[PDB]
Amino acid sequence: TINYHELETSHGRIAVRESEGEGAPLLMIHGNSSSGAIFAPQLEGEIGKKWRVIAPDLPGHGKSTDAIDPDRSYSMEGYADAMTEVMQQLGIADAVVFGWSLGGHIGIEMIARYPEMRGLMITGTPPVAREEVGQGFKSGPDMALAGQEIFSERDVESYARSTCGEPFEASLLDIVARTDGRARRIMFEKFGSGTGGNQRDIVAEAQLPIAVVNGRDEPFVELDFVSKVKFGNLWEGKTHVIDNAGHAPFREAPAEFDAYLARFIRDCTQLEHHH
């Protein structure tokens, strides 16, 4: 079973889901207007059965409260601070981190804050400097929604369908509709303004293994750009692409995604470590 509990943090009350796996811990960080509940396939499947999968809800998302201070919390760096505080409270310093989309950007910001991170996998995330946003992302009809505060019952359906892919479930509406819209607006403005660390430079200089896994039919991320990004230590020496998946391969193509994630976790935690 999945163990659910809530943490009182400086950012607000944070909802946390944990699998019962006895193995090394994996923090999974959800995307913009999503929730850790999206990682059901990993929490409840083979990944969560073996490893201790931790899937919280960001402030303003899911079953977490809105941020005590939106100006502090709703940014890639603010979320990274919140997740670092969560891991401190959970007593876990050496998790492997998986970040989906916004969660991948948060994971990149966590590299400086969480130095014993054993690896970072990013999916739906182009590491970009602020001036590279146009190169790293695909312009499109749903792109503006990322930073749009007010969602109607539509501009909730469109967002949910494009970000989560097949299969669509009504429960996805509940998740997206709950999101504190201020979090979209403030995060987006701050990212475009470079209030946090330059993500291009961070991943180029990072020594920990970074894995990059995307769906081939990504509607938001330019895969050609991603395949050209410099990483200090790119896992298996290339960026990886899963056929018949878009923005959310961990739910669209779970067995194939899990092959990458399991192999990455094993490599980052179960191999002899040298320098």
DSSP letters, the chain, are --EEEEEEETTEEEEEEE----EEEEEEE--TT--GGGGHHHHHSHHHHHEEEEEE--TTSTTSPPPS-HHHHSSHHHHHHHHHHHHHHHT-S--EEEEETHHHHHHHHHHHH-TT--EEEEES-----GGGHHHHB---TTGGGGG-S---STTTHHHHHHHH-SSP-THHHHHHHHS-HHHHHHHHHHHHHT-S--HHHHHHH--S-EEEEEETT-SSB-HHHHTT---TTBGGGS-EEETT--S-HHHHSHHHHHHHHHHHHHHHHSSPP--
Method used to obtain the model? X-ray
Could you tell me if 96 and 269 are in contact, meaning their C-beta atoms sit under 8 angstroms apart?
yes
Between strands 51-56 and 23-29, the pairing is parallel
For residue 210, which of 125, 83, 87, 273 has the smallest C-alpha distance?
125
Tokens standing for 215? 């769906």
Which residues are within 8 A (CB) of 51 and not within 5 positions of it... i.e. 6 or more apart? 19, 21, 23, 24, 25, 26, 265
Report the 10 Å Cβ neighbour count for 120.
31
Q: In what order do the strands lie in the sheet with 51-56?
A: 3-9, 12-18, 51-56, 23-29, 96-100, 119-123, 210-215, 240-242
If you search the block for the tokens 């695909």, which residue do you land on?
138
Could you tell me if 78 and 85 are in contact, meaning their C-beta atoms sit under 8 angstroms apart?
no
Q: What is the resolution of this structure in A?
A: 1.3
Partnered with residue 231 across adjacent β-strands are none
Could you tell me if 28 and 55 are in contact, meaning their C-beta atoms sit under 8 angstroms apart?
yes
Here the CATH number for the domain that contains residue 121 is 3.40.50.1820
Q: For residue 249, what are the domain limits?
A: 1-275
Could you tell me if 8 and 90 are in contact, meaning their C-beta atoms sit under 8 angstroms apart?
no
Question: Using alpha carbons only, what angle is made at residue 212 by residues 206 and 216, rounded to the nearest 5 degrees?
Answer: 155
- Residue 83 — φ and ψ, nearest 5°? -65, -35
What residue type is 59 in one-letter code?
P
Tokens standing for 234? 């790119």
Q: How many domains does the chain have?
A: 1
Could you tell me if 138 and 160 are in contact, meaning their C-beta atoms sit under 8 angstroms apart?
no
